[PDB]
C-alpha cells in the first residue's frame, strides 16, 4: 500500500552527476532502470533538464539536508522518498560509494530500480531474488529481471 503517484506521465532530473561514471553512463543506467518498471505499469517517465521534475536524482554525501544521512563508503548506498509533492518522490544516492556500469563498486542501474521502486512507493521484497529485497547484491545487469514478486507489488500500485 502506501502513497502512490496520482498521474502516469512522471518526470525526472538529475540533479548532479557522480565523479565515478561518465555523464553518458549514469544517463544510460537511470534511463534503462526508468524502463524497468514503465515495462510492466501504465507509467511513462520523461527526464528533463529545465523545469519542475517529479524525481530528483542526486548524488550527495553525509549528512547532506534531509532526515536520512549517508554513512560513508558501504553501509547504506542510497535513499528514496515515495511519491509526494517537493523532496517526495526524489532519490539519493550516497557519492562515497564508487558507482559503475559493472560487477565492481556499486552499480548503479540495479541500485536505481530498487530506489525507484520505493519512489513510486514500493516496499520491500522477502523473495531473495526480487530487486526489492532489502540489500544490494550484484547480479549480472546483462540478464536482469524483475521478479514476480516485484511485478505483483507494482501493478497492484498502478493500473
Ligand atoms: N549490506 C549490503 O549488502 C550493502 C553494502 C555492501 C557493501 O559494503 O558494498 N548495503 C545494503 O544493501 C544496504 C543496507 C542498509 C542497512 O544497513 O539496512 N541497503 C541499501 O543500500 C538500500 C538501497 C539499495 C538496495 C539495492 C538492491 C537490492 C536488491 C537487489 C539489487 C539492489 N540497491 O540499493 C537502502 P534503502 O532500502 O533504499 C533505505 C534507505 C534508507 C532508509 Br531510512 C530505509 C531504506
Ligand atoms: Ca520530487
Ligand atoms: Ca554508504
Ligand atoms: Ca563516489
Ligand atoms: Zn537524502
Ligand atoms: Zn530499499
Redesign the pocket.
Known amino acids: 500500500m502506501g502513497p502512490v503517484w496520482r498521474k502516469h506521465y512522471i518526470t525526472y532530473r538529475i540533479n548532479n552527476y557522480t565523479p565515478d561514471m561518465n555523464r553518458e553512463d549514469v544517463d544510460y543506467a537511470i534511463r534503462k532502470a526508468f524502463q524497468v518498471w514503465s515495462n510492466v505499469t501504465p507509467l511513462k517517465f520523461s527526464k528533463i533538464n529545465t523545469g519542475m521534475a517529479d524525481i530528483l536524482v542526486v548524488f550527495a554525501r553525509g549528512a547532506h539536508g534531509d532526515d536520512?544521512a549517508f554513512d560513508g563508503?558501504?553501509?547504506?548506498?542510497?535513499?528514496?522518498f515515495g511519491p509526494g509533492s517537493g523532496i517526495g518522490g526524489d532519490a539519493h544516492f550516497?557519492e562515497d560509494?564508487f558507482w559503475t556500469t559493472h560487477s565492481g563498486?556499486?552499480?548503479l542501474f540495479?541500485?536505481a530500480?530498487?530506489?525507484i521502486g520505493?519512489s513510486l512507493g514500493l516496499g520491500?521484497s522477502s523473495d531473495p531474488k526480487?530487486?526489492?529485497?532489502?540489500?544490494?547484491?550484484?547480479?549480472d545487469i546483462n540478464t536482469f529481471r524483475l521478479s514476480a514478486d516485484d511485478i505483483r507489488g507494482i501493478q497492484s500500485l498502478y493500473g
Open positions: 536520512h563508503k558501504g553501509g547504506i548506498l542510497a535513499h528514496a550516497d560509494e563498486g556499486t552499480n540495479l541500485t530500480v530498487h530506489e520505493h520491500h526480487a530487486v526489492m529485497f532489502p540489500t544490494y547484491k550484484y547480479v
